[PDB]
Amino acid sequence: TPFIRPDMKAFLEAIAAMAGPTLAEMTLEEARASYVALHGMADRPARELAVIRNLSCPGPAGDIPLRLYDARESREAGPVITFYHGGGFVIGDLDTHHNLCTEIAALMDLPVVAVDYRLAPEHPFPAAIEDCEAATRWVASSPSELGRTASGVIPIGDSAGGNATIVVSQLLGAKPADVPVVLQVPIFPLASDAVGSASLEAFAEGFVLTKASIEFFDTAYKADRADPRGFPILGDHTAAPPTIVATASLDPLRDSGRDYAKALVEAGRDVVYLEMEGVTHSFTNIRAAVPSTQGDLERIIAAMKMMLG
Amino acid sequence: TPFIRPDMKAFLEAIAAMAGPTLAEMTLEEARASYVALHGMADRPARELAVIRNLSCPGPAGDIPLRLYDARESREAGPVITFYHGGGFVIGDLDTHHNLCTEIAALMDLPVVAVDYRLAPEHPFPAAIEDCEAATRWVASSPSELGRTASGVIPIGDSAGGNATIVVSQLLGAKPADVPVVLQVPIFPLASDAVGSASLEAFAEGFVLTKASIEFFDTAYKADRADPRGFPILGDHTAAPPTIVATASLDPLRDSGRDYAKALVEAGRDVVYLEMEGVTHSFTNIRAAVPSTQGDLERIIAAMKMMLG
Amino acid sequence: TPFIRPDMKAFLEAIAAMAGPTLAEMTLEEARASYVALHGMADRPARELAVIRNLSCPGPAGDIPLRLYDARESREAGPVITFYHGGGFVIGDLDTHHNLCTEIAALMDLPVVAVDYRLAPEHPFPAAIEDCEAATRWVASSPSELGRTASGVIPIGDSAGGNATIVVSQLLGAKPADVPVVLQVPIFPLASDAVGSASLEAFAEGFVLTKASIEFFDTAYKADRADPRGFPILGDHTAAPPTIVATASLDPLRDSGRDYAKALVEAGRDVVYLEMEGVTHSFTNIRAAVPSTQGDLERIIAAMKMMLG
Amino acid sequence: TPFIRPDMKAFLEAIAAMAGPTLAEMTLEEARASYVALHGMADRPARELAVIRNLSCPGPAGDIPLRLYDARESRAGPVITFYHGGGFVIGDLDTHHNLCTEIAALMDLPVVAVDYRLAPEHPFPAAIEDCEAATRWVASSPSELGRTASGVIPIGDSAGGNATIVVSQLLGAKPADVPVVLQVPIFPLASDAVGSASLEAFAEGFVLTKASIEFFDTAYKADRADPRGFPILGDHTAAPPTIVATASLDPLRDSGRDYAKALVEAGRDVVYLEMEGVTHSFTNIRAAVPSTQGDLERIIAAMKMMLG
């Protein structure tokens, strides 16, 4: 019934034919390893960049590892992209989204700093948020170790990282970092609770991200349902920064992103809503297996350039 | 209490000091002349263009006058902008929005065809819509008299013209023209009935467009409240073309534009929602008297180039 | 490059930006409406006055509508100002010059009666003169409906109204009313035929009043070039009342006003000649858009008090 | 048949009955003495003023005597610079003294009258040289003047109205420290009267006669092509605001009409006042012809408006 691109359908069929186990059935290490293998299989290769460099910053439970990506060894002051990877706050790391980060850095000609935030179940909510916030504030202070000056920050992330993107914009909005959030890019984010949404039921199985996985992530992360830092649809939107909400039409979390973009319009904030038609959750990281998703990423990039001026 | 830009506030003060009659207290021709004078004395001068020429196309009541604007005398096939002026379907014409049209043509480097559609009270609803639709289909057919080949059409219009923009998009969506609507740009449109909205009461007086003027236009035009050609929030949004909704934060019609953008997100359509802060209705045509509004127009132009790819 | 005040020049640039059809290209109703809109946008607001009352008096073609302005609800006998608006004898009415009339009334502390005389082309020359003369004689008779006794009358008017001012003074000079003309104030009048004059060619375009408009008015009104009621330079100046001639240095009709003042001096009559420097025709009614023209009107007022005196 | 006020006519007939000699039939000093006697019997008495003070200023042929008139010992504003009538041959600071006190009292501005050199002893352009130099001196706000000039107002009757215009033109071509903000030529000689209808119509019997005009002309010997002699020939395009006052029974009436017309032709602001039924010299016969006081008060009211 719902529209699906032919290249996207064949990837869904190949996944079904491979017939892997669920996140529940695997051990934590196996589930984390499976995510690495999926993106390593499915995404386009990393871009070659002048700078791919590990860093770290002070955090509230110790140092936070980071990775800086830049097409330029040396550059003028400008906005710095602060990136938070997807993975339910349970899986993913600096390597699962490495190639995507190099693509953003190459296409934007802006530096990208990815954050290796603490994961659940070892570190439940709000550990991930504390680290993403702290690393973003650190970048915003233009520390000597970053090697370039930030005139503003651009939070961006997929899924759980899209959740972190909005929470960070709201936390910096209430208590500003040294420079402002000049643009946020939540990509298929978890913003409102997906429980009860039509997209969750309609796309519960067979569309890369499953209802089973969502429930697995939620049990490990244990976010407070009433806390805007867990579900930022509940935050104060009246001073939200310029926003690009990107969703996928076949995503169980699609309606969550629709809700957030609508809440921004309701509050009179500038927002670009892009719903990629015929593709699933995780489309930013399957750009070789489903080649048309490269074009979806480039639409987000074009919107980001426009929204930066 | 609401934020107003200093150059915007000085314009409102000059209007307040004048202490003129309402549109209903003038004769019909005096209302129309006062709108010529409003834009004439507040807008920037026309751009010089290679082509500005009057023409006409067949319509169901007779010939529809048009004005072609083009920065180039010769150009290859491409999208053609089809422009519908504001004025409540009662006032305005090809001259009240002429300078803005030359500005759109210059900055977009696309041909613009403005429509001199039939006006109420002489021609009630849906006469304006009939002429806007007929002219847009005519342009989309690449007629010889236009001298330009259309690969797509771009409906755009301010206020009542933004209403016509959405209706034309819905009508061509249901019965396609020779080429598709590739993008629509309703600018502070009337999309839903404003009666009862918070913005109507908050900005009923003192913000250029008044509640009394809205009611004066409504009585003359006589749009059917259940008819999606009168109130296109009622229409089918499931296949709406890519859209840029631009509103003003001080507009009694602001919530109508918010509602339409939210409806597009709800239906999963791609939309850029821009709410210009601290300015009023009509900001596209007061670019000399309120210089900051030139920048507002340029943001719409930048959004348009991005959405055209 | 004649001298133009900066605020005057800003106004002429906005008019040039507006562009649009000439008077002859509009319908008659559109032409009249655009004059309403011009003065409505450009003039200072009406003064508050104790008395603003519509009246009428008998005339040779029927009743003549009138408007009385007075800063006082009751006053003793004294001169009454009888005002005739400009507009080429084709456009204008009691409302186009209403704010100026309240200003004259407020600043002079004298009653003002404005005349709604018959207009061309519907009523050719000398219809406007018939009505201005009849209304001035009526006022001079101290009718009960006026509520104020006149010891004298003070004809005053701008442009075509300044033509009427001189003609009325000459007609009452030949055939006295119940009280004399104690002072006349033709403001940028048409006194001699402007065709062939240096100011007509120098200021034919771009100075509010254009040669095309003068020609449009002439074709509608059809004044006889040998008729002193059409061109009162032709009349007998030997008993002209005390006079204030006000002109504008940028007026195509400037030399006509110069001619009339010279003719009064030649006949040994008392005259104040004031030529406002750096402003155009219509300066009495653009006092908000060109704020320095308020001072020009105040000089005329001071000259009037002096001459009364 | 020309209109003449009753009080003005009584004065002309009493002059007619006296049947005095012409200027040519008198000696030069008899001529000057009779002018003193005319204004002495005919003008209203001097006003009481806080300040009536003789001064002097440098001039191109030696010091120019002056008289300052001020209702106030202490007052910055325009300063009136007055040049007396008398054909450039007769008159002095005393013949017009009472008029000067009246102008100072009614304007509440200071008046500086100029004792310029007279013909035939000093022919044209001596009078103009002194009037110009004194006005420039006043315009510099010298310490000895005792008040500060924000501008100057040249004024004068007849020959002094001629000097009023010439001074305004010379200062217009070469500015003094402050501008001429207003000039008041009173029945001026601006254009050559010979040929004018007014000169013939009023050649005899109206205080100023054709014979007197010729007598003054032969003594002063103004160059007829020189704008400093006949300022109708000057450049009017930047004339200051102007009040031209004339008299309807004046042989020089038409010259004042010509000048006011030339100002209007040039687009300059001008009040033209033509006093009805009185003659030349009405500013100085305000006791013998009491209605001429009202004529002067109209000039005063116009000056206040034009300043204003």
Ligand SMILES: CCCCCC(=O)Oc1ccc([N+](=O)[O-])cc1
């Ligand atoms: C095995 C492929 C799916 C990996 C999970 C993923 O692609 O990132 C997510 C982050 C957060 C949530 N969530 O908040 O339910 C869901 C998905």
Ligand SMILES: CCCCCC(=O)Oc1ccc([N+](=O)[O-])cc1
């Ligand atoms: C003097 C300002 C009136 C015109 C403002 C304008 O730009 O046009 C419209 C305004 C209101 C509506 N409407 O009530 O739908 C439509 C068009």
Ligand SMILES: CCCCCC(=O)Oc1ccc([N+](=O)[O-])cc1
């Ligand atoms: C569009 C503004 C200019 C026309 C109106 C105007 O300027 O008032 C006039 C009245 C009379 C005459 N005339 O008798 O030539 C000219 C002008």
Ligand SMILES: CCCCCC(=O)Oc1ccc([N+](=O)[O-])cc1
């Ligand atoms: C004996 C009475 C006449 C005295 C002279 C007079 O009335 O003052 C004049 C000043 C100048 C000129 N002039 O310049 O021809 C004429 C007259």
Ligand SMILES: CCCCCC(=O)O
């Ligand atoms: C929903 C209306 C269908 C088409 C009506 C029209 O052409 O104006």
Ligand SMILES: O=[O-]
């Ligand atoms: O026009 O309120």
